[PDB]
């Protein structure tokens, strides 16, 4: 027989057919999946008086455990099953309620924002309800559902109850972001946006996906602070870091201006760097669990040798700041001292009038001032061979993976900002963001400027042609722009940044799949032109939308600080050496655009930035950002058992894919990054990769490391993010 | 790990 | 190991067929002229064609001047110095003759009770008794020691073989069986406490533990409430994790479900309760503590073992003749062998207990195209062990007619009309529907009238030596792989699983099983018909679990799957590396 | 090795 | 360790001169009245003025309900399992009453002799017997093996 405990409390015979029926519905359309296999594996685990919820997790996980490259469709059989369990868990049945009914329930329960009911009428809800296709929950992969369940759907912290499905998330994120539009266009926008996201064309960051609809207003997750050379400013920088990390934000600190050990910060940078680290980790489980930062400094800082080794797992404690990453800032002069095998002179910023500023803003003025200050006896300084410092940096970058490079001249010669007014003098946690900053001198100092960015990405895998990107750019740029007026500003300097420039950073996911589906490869140059054509489409249509929005609503108050304001487009300023690696003609009318921007302005001083991705690219089953996958199958560790995600369309494309460690070397990838940088407003989270078993005696030569460091400078690459070294 | 040796005359041939 | 040879010169004096024929002659030598040489022939045939398998000391010694063949002894120790001295002396005698031992030292009183110095120092003394006849102090002599889960010192006993710690808290060269019943498991599900008591302070708790679960309920809650009684509380999630964390770490902390052993047993627990097991957890027999080595009122339990080769029989009804042959041989053996300790003779003469198992279960399952892990084999297994128990009883019933039932037959349930098919864990009803095929009521009446020669007949034991000689899978276990490697002076020994060429895709290998569930369903189905217990393993592949680590949750969930399906004992845990 | 964490509310649903 | 006392309440019931006179009393109790108390008087004098010194179990137990005063036992083991066992149990009994043990295990036959296994496995066994009534590892009960 075998009895079954229900949700109420009484038994009743087990309904083996009801199961096989749900199981049947679920394999709808999928190929290569055995239903009997799933029953034979779950049913053996069923015990007399087992409860309903258990039967249901048992059959999900059994579907789940069958995911392999050979039978990838299980990915979906397990999802649909989980999707089903989650409907019953939320609404007690399959059909979700009417959206208006649902919203009122959620508001009274205090889990949705009441603003939703003041902003839309029941008839407007009844109409939104018609846009919803609840059948789209059927298209998530299983690794997707696991992420929804854990990070996205509105739920219970404590009891663990789940209150909404995915289509209710998408529709309400849409309602909220587009709620202030006028009646003529609003619900058209809500529909057209809802569609873009629920079909995986536009991807949103976690705090947006998790919080837009609920009473919260915290969504800034990406802050950039610059610290001045005074106690007040360090106190201000620290306090600001504190505020922002309490709200789960990654931070880019520029502490380069701090004066060196034993200057007339008398006790030097390191003790102040430590103080930043504790600010950063002020809101973390044991002192490692959330809160993250990258700190920046110029390569010529007097204490650089001592800063290069801060996260080194050897050494003594008063010389170690290990729970932060660093970006070393380099320009053409340094690299020239490297090629010519001469020295680099270190100076403390406090002793060299306008060297620091010329570093970022005017490379000639730097030349003049550097050689000038080198010659002057009265100035405290320090010489070291340039082969030495570069090796030290590279030896550290290799050892930890996380000593990063900013090429600060590229950031200012090829940028949306004019460096005489608003220079880019740092990046953020992941090296994709590049924005101007002003140091504060109190937390609430109004003359300060901390930089924020609001992020997103197109799914290159989901669009059927480049011109599909027009609508998507419009949707993306409008949503994130509404978001800016919507979210909270804990620090006045941070509002000034966001209100004054309204900067955005929209990237891509699914580059690798995209490359495969057009039968190209990272490593050999076969993809240069496709990549050039693609990022043209991208930048162009992102500007076009921001231009159109600037007409309808006003360009951004500090638009006149940009190059764009003067008629200078990225296509005028890209590193000229790219000319030698691609010949793809421009396809779109950039002069029409030149004039239209110059006249009407832009809503957003920046629009593009290539960021890393993991959560987001799981939800759509897409390759991560622009990176080649390590393998065909991803493994995540989870209380619910092993999570597997097979790269999109494996069965047809396993020989199309170029996997990470199958690339002969870094050269094609960097050519591809550099081609993106021709059109991207900010930077790219660009990796370097080294397989030790490709090198004599299993050891990576300092020669290849530097030769690659220069390949990237030459092709105009602004930043280098992680180094990955494979084991064996 | 990493092979300390660096050739400057190799390098001097790179154009930035 | 088998052929009669020279210790020193290394000369070999007989071949295998001379072994088989003389083992047969010897065991059947007292039969009358009309039947003798027919029995010798019919037995010789059964063994030389690999249908019946005999243990090592029988195969090695029956024909020669020796008389030592007991290789499986169970002692129970009382709570007094005399008894520890008696238990120890008995252990000494028996290990000199290469015997494995099950000690029950559960009755020993706890540290600082009115054994004043506690169990551990006495446990150590048992260990040295055990190893008294061993090369360097690890080479031969083996034992498993038993205790109830509620013993005051349990936390200190759970960690005895732990490779960390200090020496006066470590007994590492013995295995342990922790004894559990329904109450404990209930405190686990409900996440409440377990109260520990020293057996000396709790009148009839120890006895009710094994004999009467209700009387235990009543007495436990009663003693929990009483302030005057030395006791100790601990969350039940804690103790269970500790046990399971130890079982996992060493492989060799074993479980006895003592209620199952007494509610589903050939013995009536009001007269003769089962209060322990043996070295390998397959044996389950009643014992009485001695108070001197030669104490006549003592009872140490012995069993004489064997097994059918499921791979060698062409049909289930071939098992009739084999049961007759098996049961008659081992019965003759009982009158034949020596008895170093009077208590041990009383056991063997009074109940004449046997334990006949199987080898080649895995091959058998393959040859019928079934699998451990998925439930495809439940019914075949149910049909098979029916045949087995039935025909084993039938032969012991027939032998009881010809020669007399055993003197203590009236202590069994069988004597009262109760068959195993009346007493099996009812939850098995939900995992198989195989009808009984044999007439169990005809059998009920015939046993009740004529008796049994042997109070027990069945016990599923591990096997290695025996299953090598016939090229059979080991006991009831799935093979780790298709090829076995043994280290040998003569070079590497390889044995490929029987009929590989045809059946490599039939076999379900150990580490190919999704988990423990089907196997435990199969063990539980055997336990419906087996007189004693089963040497049942649990298995865990770390690379099937998030971050290569086996969750305490699965360990306990399996511990309960086994209780539910009525499984009496759990023997080794195997954890694969990588 | 072993994952210490034990869920009692999971367990309480087992029947012996 | 001499004065009669409750070992949990920590109460002391007697004093040193009661110890001395009453120990005299018990050991001379069965003497003929013609001479009894005279003996009792003189033995008390001798011990109370430190001229004669007595062993602890006599000093702490004589006068009390106990009768275990043997602190000092010698056992000879023969070369046979029964002898081993007998030796072992003798030890266990005595060490549970606190005695120290000398043990002659010299005649146990050597390893390899036609009991194939030799002295050491049995010597471990005596050791565990000697310690069978002691805390754990290094605390109480002692022996010397010859």
PDB file of N, CA, C and O in Angstrom, chain E residues 2-4 13-30 36-37 39-45 47-48 54 57-67 69:
ATOM      1  N   UNK E   2      44.618   8.316  57.882  1.00  0.00           N
ATOM      2  CA  UNK E   2      44.578   7.444  59.029  1.00  0.00           C
ATOM      3  C   UNK E   2      43.224   7.619  59.771  1.00  0.00           C
ATOM      4  O   UNK E   2      42.478   6.656  60.004  1.00  0.00           O
ATOM      5  N   UNK E   3      42.917   8.863  60.137  1.00  0.00           N
ATOM      6  CA  UNK E   3      41.777   9.158  60.995  1.00  0.00           C
ATOM      7  C   UNK E   3      40.491   8.730  60.333  1.00  0.00           C
ATOM      8  O   UNK E   3      40.270   9.056  59.182  1.00  0.00           O
ATOM      9  N   UNK E   4      39.663   7.975  61.052  1.00  0.00           N
ATOM     10  CA  UNK E   4      38.307   7.625  60.587  1.00  0.00           C
ATOM     11  C   UNK E   4      37.494   8.889  60.261  1.00  0.00           C
ATOM     12  O   UNK E   4      37.364   9.806  61.088  1.00  0.00           O
ATOM     13  N   UNK E  13      35.787  11.961  62.623  1.00  0.00           N
ATOM     14  CA  UNK E  13      35.087  11.430  63.807  1.00  0.00           C
ATOM     15  C   UNK E  13      35.976  11.158  65.018  1.00  0.00           C
ATOM     16  O   UNK E  13      35.523  11.314  66.146  1.00  0.00           O
ATOM     17  N   UNK E  14      37.223  10.754  64.789  1.00  0.00           N
ATOM     18  CA  UNK E  14      38.130  10.383  65.882  1.00  0.00           C
ATOM     19  C   UNK E  14      39.343  11.309  65.982  1.00  0.00           C
ATOM     20  O   UNK E  14      39.442  12.264  65.216  1.00  0.00           O
ATOM     21  N   UNK E  15      40.231  11.026  66.947  1.00  0.00           N
ATOM     22  CA  UNK E  15      41.542  11.688  67.076  1.00  0.00           C
ATOM     23  C   UNK E  15      42.693  10.660  67.201  1.00  0.00           C
ATOM     24  O   UNK E  15      42.461   9.464  67.406  1.00  0.00           O
ATOM     25  N   UNK E  16      43.928  11.123  67.044  1.00  0.00           N
ATOM     26  CA  UNK E  16      45.053  10.217  66.935  1.00  0.00           C
ATOM     27  C   UNK E  16      45.203   9.228  68.101  1.00  0.00           C
ATOM     28  O   UNK E  16      45.633   8.097  67.879  1.00  0.00           O
ATOM     29  N   UNK E  17      44.859   9.624  69.329  1.00  0.00           N
ATOM     30  CA  UNK E  17      45.066   8.701  70.462  1.00  0.00           C
ATOM     31  C   UNK E  17      43.994   7.593  70.567  1.00  0.00           C
ATOM     32  O   UNK E  17      44.287   6.477  71.023  1.00  0.00           O
ATOM     33  N   UNK E  18      42.767   7.904  70.144  1.00  0.00           N
ATOM     34  CA  UNK E  18      41.761   6.870  69.931  1.00  0.00           C
ATOM     35  C   UNK E  18      42.247   5.877  68.853  1.00  0.00           C
ATOM     36  O   UNK E  18      42.262   4.653  69.073  1.00  0.00           O
ATOM     37  N   UNK E  19      42.678   6.390  67.707  1.00  0.00           N
ATOM     38  CA  UNK E  19      43.315   5.521  66.744  1.00  0.00           C
ATOM     39  C   UNK E  19      44.294   4.581  67.454  1.00  0.00           C
ATOM     40  O   UNK E  19      44.230   3.360  67.283  1.00  0.00           O
ATOM     41  N   UNK E  20      45.175   5.136  68.276  1.00  0.00           N
ATOM     42  CA  UNK E  20      46.255   4.324  68.808  1.00  0.00           C
ATOM     43  C   UNK E  20      45.788   3.284  69.785  1.00  0.00           C
ATOM     44  O   UNK E  20      46.162   2.153  69.646  1.00  0.00           O
ATOM     45  N   UNK E  21      44.948   3.664  70.749  1.00  0.00           N
ATOM     46  CA  UNK E  21      44.459   2.735  71.791  1.00  0.00           C
ATOM     47  C   UNK E  21      43.560   1.648  71.189  1.00  0.00           C
ATOM     48  O   UNK E  21      43.721   0.462  71.502  1.00  0.00           O
ATOM     49  N   UNK E  22      42.648   2.050  70.298  1.00  0.00           N
ATOM     50  CA  UNK E  22      41.690   1.113  69.735  1.00  0.00           C
ATOM     51  C   UNK E  22      42.335   0.126  68.785  1.00  0.00           C
ATOM     52  O   UNK E  22      41.838  -0.988  68.638  1.00  0.00           O
ATOM     53  N   UNK E  23      43.433   0.528  68.143  1.00  0.00           N
ATOM     54  CA  UNK E  23      44.180  -0.390  67.271  1.00  0.00           C
ATOM     55  C   UNK E  23      44.840  -1.448  68.156  1.00  0.00           C
ATOM     56  O   UNK E  23      44.815  -2.656  67.834  1.00  0.00           O
ATOM     57  N   UNK E  24      45.407  -0.980  69.276  1.00  0.00           N
ATOM     58  CA  UNK E  24      45.894  -1.852  70.330  1.00  0.00           C
ATOM     59  C   UNK E  24      44.773  -2.808  70.779  1.00  0.00           C
ATOM     60  O   UNK E  24      44.941  -4.034  70.783  1.00  0.00           O
ATOM     61  N   UNK E  25      43.621  -2.252  71.136  1.00  0.00           N
ATOM     62  CA  UNK E  25      42.493  -3.073  71.551  1.00  0.00           C
ATOM     63  C   UNK E  25      42.207  -4.215  70.545  1.00  0.00           C
ATOM     64  O   UNK E  25      42.331  -5.394  70.883  1.00  0.00           O
ATOM     65  N   UNK E  26      41.882  -3.876  69.301  1.00  0.00           N
ATOM     66  CA  UNK E  26      41.530  -4.902  68.323  1.00  0.00           C
ATOM     67  C   UNK E  26      42.571  -6.015  68.169  1.00  0.00           C
ATOM     68  O   UNK E  26      42.207  -7.190  68.115  1.00  0.00           O
ATOM     69  N   UNK E  27      43.855  -5.676  68.131  1.00  0.00           N
ATOM     70  CA  UNK E  27      44.864  -6.699  67.851  1.00  0.00           C
ATOM     71  C   UNK E  27      45.203  -7.541  69.081  1.00  0.00           C
ATOM     72  O   UNK E  27      45.948  -8.512  68.972  1.00  0.00           O
ATOM     73  N   UNK E  28      44.696  -7.170  70.249  1.00  0.00           N
ATOM     74  CA  UNK E  28      45.016  -7.938  71.465  1.00  0.00           C
ATOM     75  C   UNK E  28      43.751  -8.475  72.151  1.00  0.00           C
ATOM     76  O   UNK E  28      43.837  -9.216  73.157  1.00  0.00           O
ATOM     77  N   UNK E  29      42.602  -8.118  71.553  1.00  0.00           N
ATOM     78  CA  UNK E  29      41.263  -8.545  71.975  1.00  0.00           C
ATOM     79  C   UNK E  29      41.134 -10.000  72.488  1.00  0.00           C
ATOM     80  O   UNK E  29      40.537 -10.236  73.543  1.00  0.00           O
ATOM     81  N   UNK E  30      41.696 -10.958  71.757  1.00  0.00           N
ATOM     82  CA  UNK E  30      41.499 -12.370  72.073  1.00  0.00           C
ATOM     83  C   UNK E  30      42.501 -12.890  73.083  1.00  0.00           C
ATOM     84  O   UNK E  30      42.623 -14.101  73.269  1.00  0.00           O
ATOM     85  N   UNK E  36      45.693  -9.329  79.029  1.00  0.00           N
ATOM     86  CA  UNK E  36      45.125  -8.540  77.901  1.00  0.00           C
ATOM     87  C   UNK E  36      45.476  -7.052  77.929  1.00  0.00           C
ATOM     88  O   UNK E  36      46.314  -6.602  77.139  1.00  0.00           O
ATOM     89  N   UNK E  37      44.826  -6.310  78.830  1.00  0.00           N
ATOM     90  CA  UNK E  37      44.986  -4.863  78.981  1.00  0.00           C
ATOM     91  C   UNK E  37      46.437  -4.408  79.209  1.00  0.00           C
ATOM     92  O   UNK E  37      46.811  -3.290  78.870  1.00  0.00           O
ATOM     93  N   UNK E  39      49.050  -5.849  77.785  1.00  0.00           N
ATOM     94  CA  UNK E  39      49.558  -5.807  76.419  1.00  0.00           C
ATOM     95  C   UNK E  39      49.064  -4.555  75.702  1.00  0.00           C
ATOM     96  O   UNK E  39      49.854  -3.836  75.088  1.00  0.00           O
ATOM     97  N   UNK E  40      47.758  -4.298  75.815  1.00  0.00           N
ATOM     98  CA  UNK E  40      47.112  -3.150  75.179  1.00  0.00           C
ATOM     99  C   UNK E  40      47.773  -1.861  75.633  1.00  0.00           C
ATOM    100  O   UNK E  40      48.055  -0.984  74.802  1.00  0.00           O
ATOM    101  N   UNK E  41      48.049  -1.753  76.933  1.00  0.00           N
ATOM    102  CA  UNK E  41      48.728  -0.567  77.454  1.00  0.00           C
ATOM    103  C   UNK E  41      50.122  -0.364  76.804  1.00  0.00           C
ATOM    104  O   UNK E  41      50.483   0.752  76.396  1.00  0.00           O
ATOM    105  N   UNK E  42      50.889  -1.436  76.686  1.00  0.00           N
ATOM    106  CA  UNK E  42      52.272  -1.277  76.320  1.00  0.00           C
ATOM    107  C   UNK E  42      52.471  -1.064  74.822  1.00  0.00           C
ATOM    108  O   UNK E  42      53.365  -0.323  74.421  1.00  0.00           O
ATOM    109  N   UNK E  43      51.613  -1.679  74.005  1.00  0.00           N
ATOM    110  CA  UNK E  43      51.639  -1.488  72.557  1.00  0.00           C
ATOM    111  C   UNK E  43      51.166  -0.097  72.192  1.00  0.00           C
ATOM    112  O   UNK E  43      51.661   0.490  71.238  1.00  0.00           O
ATOM    113  N   UNK E  44      50.182   0.417  72.927  1.00  0.00           N
ATOM    114  CA  UNK E  44      49.727   1.790  72.716  1.00  0.00           C
ATOM    115  C   UNK E  44      50.880   2.747  73.012  1.00  0.00           C
ATOM    116  O   UNK E  44      51.236   3.580  72.167  1.00  0.00           O
ATOM    117  N   UNK E  45      51.482   2.610  74.194  1.00  0.00           N
ATOM    118  CA  UNK E  45      52.649   3.431  74.523  1.00  0.00           C
ATOM    119  C   UNK E  45      53.647   3.415  73.377  1.00  0.00           C
ATOM    120  O   UNK E  45      54.015   4.467  72.895  1.00  0.00           O
ATOM    121  N   UNK E  47      53.485   2.696  70.153  1.00  0.00           N
ATOM    122  CA  UNK E  47      53.136   3.317  68.872  1.00  0.00           C
ATOM    123  C   UNK E  47      52.855   4.811  68.990  1.00  0.00           C
ATOM    124  O   UNK E  47      53.196   5.568  68.075  1.00  0.00           O
ATOM    125  N   UNK E  48      52.249   5.214  70.116  1.00  0.00           N
ATOM    126  CA  UNK E  48      51.908   6.611  70.368  1.00  0.00           C
ATOM    127  C   UNK E  48      53.167   7.456  70.666  1.00  0.00           C
ATOM    128  O   UNK E  48      53.154   8.698  70.565  1.00  0.00           O
ATOM    129  N   UNK E  54      53.430   1.519  62.108  1.00  0.00           N
ATOM    130  CA  UNK E  54      52.524   0.584  61.443  1.00  0.00           C
ATOM    131  C   UNK E  54      52.129   0.976  59.989  1.00  0.00           C
ATOM    132  O   UNK E  54      52.129   2.176  59.641  1.00  0.00           O
ATOM    133  N   UNK E  57      47.120   0.564  55.850  1.00  0.00           N
ATOM    134  CA  UNK E  57      45.804  -0.056  55.910  1.00  0.00           C
ATOM    135  C   UNK E  57      45.460  -0.574  57.315  1.00  0.00           C
ATOM    136  O   UNK E  57      44.285  -0.848  57.606  1.00  0.00           O
ATOM    137  N   UNK E  58      46.488  -0.721  58.157  1.00  0.00           N
ATOM    138  CA  UNK E  58      46.349  -1.198  59.529  1.00  0.00           C
ATOM    139  C   UNK E  58      46.067   0.025  60.342  1.00  0.00           C
ATOM    140  O   UNK E  58      45.127   0.061  61.098  1.00  0.00           O
ATOM    141  N   UNK E  59      46.873   1.046  60.154  1.00  0.00           N
ATOM    142  CA  UNK E  59      46.625   2.337  60.775  1.00  0.00           C
ATOM    143  C   UNK E  59      45.271   3.010  60.462  1.00  0.00           C
ATOM    144  O   UNK E  59      44.746   3.750  61.292  1.00  0.00           O
ATOM    145  N   UNK E  60      44.702   2.754  59.289  1.00  0.00           N
ATOM    146  CA  UNK E  60      43.441   3.391  58.922  1.00  0.00           C
ATOM    147  C   UNK E  60      42.212   2.503  59.098  1.00  0.00           C
ATOM    148  O   UNK E  60      41.094   3.013  59.278  1.00  0.00           O
ATOM    149  N   UNK E  61      42.416   1.188  59.068  1.00  0.00           N
ATOM    150  CA  UNK E  61      41.322   0.234  59.098  1.00  0.00           C
ATOM    151  C   UNK E  61      41.090  -0.555  60.370  1.00  0.00           C
ATOM    152  O   UNK E  61      39.960  -0.918  60.661  1.00  0.00           O
ATOM    153  N   UNK E  62      42.140  -0.844  61.126  1.00  0.00           N
ATOM    154  CA  UNK E  62      41.977  -1.669  62.343  1.00  0.00           C
ATOM    155  C   UNK E  62      41.247  -0.878  63.434  1.00  0.00           C
ATOM    156  O   UNK E  62      41.744   0.146  63.877  1.00  0.00           O
ATOM    157  N   UNK E  63      40.090  -1.412  63.848  1.00  0.00           N
ATOM    158  CA  UNK E  63      39.025  -0.746  64.634  1.00  0.00           C
ATOM    159  C   UNK E  63      37.723  -0.587  63.809  1.00  0.00           C
ATOM    160  O   UNK E  63      36.631  -0.625  64.385  1.00  0.00           O
ATOM    161  N   UNK E  64      37.842  -0.431  62.478  1.00  0.00           N
ATOM    162  CA  UNK E  64      36.663  -0.296  61.567  1.00  0.00           C
ATOM    163  C   UNK E  64      36.051  -1.643  61.117  1.00  0.00           C
ATOM    164  O   UNK E  64      36.601  -2.708  61.384  1.00  0.00           O
ATOM    165  N   UNK E  65      34.862  -1.610  60.497  1.00  0.00           N
ATOM    166  CA  UNK E  65      34.292  -2.879  60.008  1.00  0.00           C
ATOM    167  C   UNK E  65      35.115  -3.664  59.006  1.00  0.00           C
ATOM    168  O   UNK E  65      34.798  -4.817  58.786  1.00  0.00           O
ATOM    169  N   UNK E  66      36.155  -3.084  58.414  1.00  0.00           N
ATOM    170  CA  UNK E  66      36.887  -3.794  57.353  1.00  0.00           C
ATOM    171  C   UNK E  66      37.846  -4.860  57.864  1.00  0.00           C
ATOM    172  O   UNK E  66      38.224  -4.840  59.029  1.00  0.00           O
ATOM    173  N   UNK E  67      38.229  -5.789  56.981  1.00  0.00           N
ATOM    174  CA  UNK E  67      39.253  -6.823  57.292  1.00  0.00           C
ATOM    175  C   UNK E  67      40.367  -6.982  56.239  1.00  0.00           C
ATOM    176  O   UNK E  67      41.127  -7.950  56.271  1.00  0.00           O
ATOM    177  N   UNK E  69      43.777  -5.963  54.997  1.00  0.00           N
ATOM    178  CA  UNK E  69      45.022  -5.348  55.444  1.00  0.00           C
ATOM    179  C   UNK E  69      46.272  -5.849  54.678  1.00  0.00           C
ATOM    180  O   UNK E  69      47.378  -5.272  54.805  1.00  0.00           O
TER     181      UNK E  69
END
